[PDB]
Amino acid sequence: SVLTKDRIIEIIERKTGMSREEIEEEIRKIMEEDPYLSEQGAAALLAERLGIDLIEKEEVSLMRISELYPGMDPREVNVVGRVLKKYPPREYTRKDGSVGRVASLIIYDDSGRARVVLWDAKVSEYYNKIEVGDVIKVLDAQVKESLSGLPELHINFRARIILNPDDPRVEMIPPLEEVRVATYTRKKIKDIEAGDRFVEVRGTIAKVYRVLTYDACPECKKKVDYDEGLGVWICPEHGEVQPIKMTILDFGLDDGTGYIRVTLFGDDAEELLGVSPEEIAEKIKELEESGLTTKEAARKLAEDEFYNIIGREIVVRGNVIEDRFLGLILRASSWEDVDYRREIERIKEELEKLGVM
Amino acid sequence: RRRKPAVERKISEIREEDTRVSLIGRVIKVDKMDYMFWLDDGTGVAIIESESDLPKVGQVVRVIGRIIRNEEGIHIYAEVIQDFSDADLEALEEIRELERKLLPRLEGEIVW
Amino acid sequence: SKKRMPATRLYIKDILEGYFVKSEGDFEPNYLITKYARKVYRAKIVGTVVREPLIAEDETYGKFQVDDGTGVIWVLGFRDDTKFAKLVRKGDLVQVIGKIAEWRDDKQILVEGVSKVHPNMWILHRYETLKEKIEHIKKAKIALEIYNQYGITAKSKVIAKNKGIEEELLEVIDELYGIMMEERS
Ligand SMILES: [Zn+2]
């Protein structure tokens, strides 16, 4: 249905800043030239001359960045976010000899942050025009998820980007001035929900699931994906890179109130296990040769070599994501030894609530 | 008859009925010829006869052993000697007072 | 559907003085209800290993004694779980987590993990164990009054909900009452 006479006046008031009395005079001037036009049609013609009549191109939605999930229908993707960071554009040589481009842009809204990955022609089409502070509209993008628990909006040939759109969610995004570094908040496993971010959990290791290594970028320490059609490992921030080994440690945490699966990464996982990732990769290769699959070898290595860490009280910090098959996973970016003096003070405060002290 | 637990007591609080005790203190003197070391926890000094493991002078240790009550005197025959040098002794004393006042009260709250 | 019960940090004395309930059903695990009506599935103790571990020649079983001051419990591992007895020695301060089991009417812990802990962790363990004992006993004291006045009825379940008491706690008190009445006779 076409917009009403008063709705066209309202859109012209917002897009032109003219008063209602000024717009009513311009509509009368159009109806003087052509008396066969309606009060609604004159306003539509006024908007067409102004350049506002492109109002039919309305793709409004209320999807937040937190609501993005990996492996979702790109057609359902409709999020808006202000550009916080702009990473340098990198180049990669394809199988056909042609050199493609790739650039990362960190965007954010009132719920969370997302990594926009521009691909090939979308880099020269948008990156040059995109500045820090502009609110972009990500449409039809492939949604992936990084190991840290951050969503990724891969801008391919099907994806579209609108610079500074007429969307109501743009006002709800806080300015760059107010954005502060979110610190880790202490939360019991009993109260841990799916989609929680920056949570510090103190618990005990109760079981070790898998110990294996993954190919990662040698500069930002992030998982690289192998393109079979090009033959190169491409980092979604540094382009064509030589991959290095990094440790993944899947284990269970127990704080007396609940249980949750925790995953460790690179330098932090190597610190807890005590074995380098190059040595872990070698031990996995030996188990794979014996007839065990990649997941069987990772599970065996964890139970036959890294069983000593089970029963140690450790502190983990990261985001809680919900896997479609493994349930709640606290993907801990960093881990630290229990500050015993600080953990005793937390107990003392709870004893005062009970009436002990 | 199960093995008796190490009753955590101070050197001044050593009751004659105790058989195995947990004394946590600082070593003040070490005799390597007789394999004995003097322990001081702040309430008293006791001779600790160790089997072979001899700690250093000034090192804070936790000693679990059997009380030797005979005509020679009252000393502790060491079985386990742990390193309590990095232990917060102020926090150890605070939880001891909390357990002494709350644990006997909680034991008799839910008894039917 | 797939739920894992959290380990309850308890004193050894509480586990020994508790009542082991061996579940006959295939979809139900074994639990121990302490004298203060605490349904505990997994045990979490922190203590000193008083004796050198007993490891079999054919590596079929491994056991070690743990002492926290309140009591001495046995920790056992079989076939591949024998690797846990090899980690410890006579004199180590360790934290043990595992399922509670009863052998010849004597309580013991089927080891799931054991590792050496710092002396400050042992202090922290006493703070948490004392704290959780105060929290549970105060909640069960109010729930005992609801059970002694109404029992397990639809009316008593609403009154317990208003007093911040879980419905399972009332059922644990009833289960404990049945065990104690069998001991009297
Ligand atoms: Zn990179």
Residue numbers in the entry:
A (entry chain A): 2 to 358
B (entry chain C): 6 to 117
C (entry chain B): 1 to 185
Question: How does the study describe this entry?
Answer:
Replication Protein A (RPA) is a heterotrimeric single stranded DNA-binding protein with essential roles in DNA replication, recombination and repair. We report three crystal structures and five cryo-EM structures of Pyrococcus abyssi RPA (hereafter referred to PabRPA), in its apo form as well as bound to ssDNA. We find that archaeal and eukaryotic RPAs share a conserved heterotrimerization core, which is composed of three OB domains connected through a three-helix bundle formed by a C-terminal α-helix from each subunit.
We biochemically reconstituted, crystallized and determined the 3.7 Å X-ray crystal structure of a heterotrimeric complex of P. abyssi Rpa1, Rpa2, and Rpa3 subunits. PabRPA contains four OB domains, named OB-1, OB-2, OB-3, and OB-4, which share the highest structural similarity with OB-A, OB-C, OB-D and OB-E in eukaryotic RPA, respectively. Like in its eukaryotic OB-C counterparts, PabRPA OB-2 contains a Zn-finger motif that is inserted between β-strands β1 and β2, and a short helical domain that is inserted between β-strands β3 and β4. The Tri-C adopts a compact quaternary structure consisting of OB-2 of Rpa1, OB-3 of Rpa2, and OB-4 of Rpa3, which is the smallest subunit. Similar to the eukaryotic RPA, heterotrimerization of PabRPA is primarily mediated through a three-helix bundle formed by a C-terminal α-helix from each subunit. The trimerization helix of Rpa2 is followed by a helix-turn-helix motif, which stabilizes the Tri-C by extending the contacts between the Rpa2 and Rpa3 subunits. The N-terminal region of Rpa1 hosts two independent domains, which adopt an extended conformation in contrast to the compact structure of the Tri-C: the OB-1 DNA-binding domain and an archaea-specific helical domain named AROD (Acidic Rpa1 OB-binding Domain). Interestingly, in the PabRPA crystal structure, the tri-helical bundle simultaneously stacks against the OB-4 and OB-1 domains of the neighboring Rpa3 and Rpa1 chains, respectively, through a crystal lattice contact. Interestingly, the same OB-3/OB-3 interaction forms a crystal-packing contact in the crystal structure of full-length PabRPA in its apo form.
